[PDB]
């Protein structure tokens, strides 16, 4: 095709149309599928990002385990790249009210996908039974705050994998582990997080009871952002999204 914009410009345009008369323009399901088709095509070289290797030395507290390249954002969506060093994870977290789509650029990530049980989805979340104990033991305040959940999947993804999609009510919690070296992925979220307006990134831990196939029910506890987890910016080297 002549006169085609960069792939990342086209992804940004499509995300904007997806998330925000005659002839009728596409609706949301068509737009989301087109967005997924564009992400399926995206390669690290399309963003001028070369695959990284050999984060050879142990990671001191001075250095961020994960870095972030900002590409674009509107009120409707955010668009950027997360780059995980060898042996690091983005800990389990949610995306309140949000859709998400990500695409691995290089390396391998294990993505564990979960949900809190939602009575709007025909579930009946129970309270933690009193005789239920965990390792480490739960403070009584924590017992009241435990949420039943479901661990749906825990697969490994590479650049060959299709994009990974989440919705407000399905696969809305995920953890992302870098497997066998550094890894990176492009992430689209809609709407973007907004701490100032009560749309936060919440972290969770899965509790380990005292006394196995997926899906399986789990107990979840909201937890602060881990002391050793942070994610600082670095320059984005790819084609610029205009304006
Ligand atoms: Ni996420």
Numbering used by the authors: 3 to 22, 40 to 230, 239 to 270
Any passages from the paper?
Herein, we report the first crystal structure of human ADO at a resolution of 1.78 Å with a nickel-bound metal center. Crystallization was achieved through both metal substitution and C18S/C239S double mutations. In order to obtain hADO with a homogeneous metal center and prevent oxidation via the iron center, hADO cell culture was grown with minimal media supplemented with NiSO4 during induction of hADO expression. Most of the polypeptide residues are observed except the N-terminal tag, residues 22–40 and 230–239. Despite the flexibility, the core of the hADO structure is a “jelly roll” β-barrel that supports a catalytic center. The structure of hADO shows a metal ion octahedrally coordinated by three histidine residues and three water molecules, which is a typical ligand scaffold for thiol dioxygenases. The protein-derived ligands are His112 and His114 from Loop 3 and His193 from β6. The metal center of ADO sits in a tunnel formed by the β-barrel. Instead, residues 137–144 of Loop 4 intrude into the catalytic center of an adjacent, crystallographic symmetry-related molecule, forming interactions with residues at the active site entrance. Additionally, extra electron density was found in the active site cavity, which was best fitted with a glycerol molecule from the cryoprotectant.
Cysteamine dioxygenase (ADO) plays a vital role in regulating thiol metabolism and preserving oxygen homeostasis in humans by oxidizing the sulfur of cysteamine and N-terminal cysteine-containing proteins to their corresponding sulfinic acids using O2 as a cosubstrate. Among all thiol dioxygenases, ADO stands out for its broader spectrum of substrates. It is the only enzyme of this protein family that oxidizes both small-molecule and protein substrates. Hence, in addition to regulating thiol metabolism, ADO initiates a transduction cascade, signaling hypoxia and preserving oxygen homeostasis in humans. pmcThiol dioxygenases constitute a family of nonheme iron enzymes containing a ferrous iron center coordinated by three histidine residues.
